Amino acid sequence: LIMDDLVEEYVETEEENLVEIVESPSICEGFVQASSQTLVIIPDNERITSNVLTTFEATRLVAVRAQQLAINGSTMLKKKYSSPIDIAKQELFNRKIPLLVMRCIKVTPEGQKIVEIWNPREMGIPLLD
């Protein structure tokens, strides 16, 4: 008759305090898809973000390049390195990386994805070697 495995009833006590008209059209109810965006690339002379790669951006570039060299491997590097990580790091250091950095500055309500496109081959590299 003795049951040991009790479940410990759980209680929430602090209540939240968040602060014509027809049935529904095919517009107000629905349209979860969200309208497509157009890519508004800021002109190179209007860019305000840093011309130096952050350690996050440089690390992501190296990781993406090395993962791509894992499946690919056609490389523009001169010296031969035995690991994709070293190859990607030297590609970034030799300014031969085939990737670009897009910094999404703002998404407008009208449907514009305002971005700044930065070339890592003309950027400052903060990584170590």
């Binding site: 629905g30 979860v32 969200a34 497509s36 890519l39």
Partner: protein, 98 residues
């Protein structure tokens, strides 16, 4: 062996990712979720057996491939079991002006 809340906080304080990804998805229950993108409901996609369908809007199925975890899928299923409708809006497609 568990990578708890605080380990994730430390990893995201270092801004890591790609290790949160590796451990929490590739070395954990990480899976692939399919959403219709037209209604936001979990869609049915199968490449081998040809299945591209949505139990919601049928001819309007536009299935997107979303990286997820089985824990999150189970959590959303549990929310829907309590009669709470979960709809994923999905990121809009962005197009470069030609």
């Amino acid at each position: 062996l568990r990578l708890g809340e605080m380990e994730h906080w430390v990893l995201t304080a270092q801004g890591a990712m790609q290790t949160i990804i590796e451990k929490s998805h590739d070395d954990s229950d990480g899976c692939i979720s399919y959403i219709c993108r037209n209604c936001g409901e979990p869609a049915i996609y199968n490449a081998s057996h040809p299945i591209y369908k949505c139990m919601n809007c049928d001819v309007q199925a536009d299935i997107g491939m979303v990286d997820s975890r089985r824990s999150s899928i189970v959590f959303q299923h549990e929310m829907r079991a309590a009669n709470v409708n979960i709809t994923s809006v999905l990121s809009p497609r962005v197009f470069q002006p030609a």
